[PDB]
């Protein structure tokens, strides 16, 4: 019941930030097989009608093919919409780290610095804690709203998202990121809290 | 206090089953990388002065526990994948000999162990190890190493997505298969003798 969602750009208009290649694969094998192993795993079960959010929502946050795939889907997902080639730091969510970490370029060492200690497969996260914004990073394909915080902007740390072209180098893909956020629906995000 | 190993052939030895650039960069960055980093937590401490399969199995102060477990992990398992690859695999001696006892035949060892390694979600390793005298074939998350829950590792396969991504991108499997071509088996019977 899943579809894999269909990319609001081309694949080669984040470059040459992120490669055309990794973005095809990406999408195409990885998201792809999520999606797939998915609603392989939903057949018949309590959560056939439920939005990949809820699902995931109400997982567990300390193995089973839900939460690796259910998770996938929904972090790739959110994504390719907070990906933009037309990336403007300005809008709600901006003015709003200014507010908490002083300046743009604060918040982004220390997101920076969370992905980059991300050990192994992950994801680094801004989420929305009862109001006030917080950098979290999760394992393989958890995703803070299982923690009860929402997630507003995401950056996949899994090496399949950067090592085409960066190879070991994480810190130059989580440098490249910022010349791609989609700030736009960063604010979308945060407004449906 | 710990140093980076040479490889025991050549970055191109093991092609075509495992391409160059991957183990020139496996191995002058991110294994060095994890070098670096557990130098860096083992500056001033009774750990400098240890074996790293005794750091690894005895897992230490809370502060450097996970840059150690990361990192010491990541040195040890490493230093155990270069030596376990060989440019001449050859199947035969005491292990493949308990394997086809154990398992009926090797093709059912690799097929059990393809789907754990398959299956191992995110990164990590596919493990045969010694547990009391038998075997079992485990995964590991990250850089874990199964010295940590006693067991002893003679086999071993990284499946961190650098180990596999410029040659067959998702297509871990492929890199499963890849892999019996280039074990070195002489160094897992080696292995195995500690027990
Ligand atoms: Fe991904
Ligand atoms: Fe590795």
Redesign the interface.
């Given at each position: 019941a899943f579809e894999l969602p269909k990319l609001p750009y081309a694949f080669d208009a984040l470059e040459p930030h992120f490669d055309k290649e990794t973005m095809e694969?990406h999408h195409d094998?990885?998201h792809n097989?999520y999606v797939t192993k998915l609603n392989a795993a939903v057949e018949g079960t309590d959560l056939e009608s439920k939005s990949i959010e809820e699902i995931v929502a109400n997982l567990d946050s300390v193995?089973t093919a839900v939460r690796?795939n259910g998770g996938g889907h929904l972090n790739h997902s959110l994504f390719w919409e907070l990906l933009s080639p037309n990336s403007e730091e300005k809008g709600t969510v901006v003015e709003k780290i200014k507010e908490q970490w002083g300046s743009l370029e604060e918040f982004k060492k220390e997101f920076a610095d969370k992905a980059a200690a991300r050990?192994?497969?992950?994801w680094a996260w801004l989420v929305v804690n009862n109001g006030q914004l917080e950098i979290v990073t999760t394992?393989?394909?958890d995703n803070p709203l299982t923690e009860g915080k929402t997630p507003i902007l995401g950056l996949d740390v899994?090496?399949?998202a950067y090592?085409?072209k960066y190879?070991?180098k994480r810190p130059d893909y989580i440098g490249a990121f910022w010349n791609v956020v989609n700030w736009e629906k960063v604010d979308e995000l945060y407004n449906a809290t």
């Open positions: 694969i094998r990885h097989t193995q690796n050990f192994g497969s992950g394992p393989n394909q899994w090496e399949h090592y085409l190879q070991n």
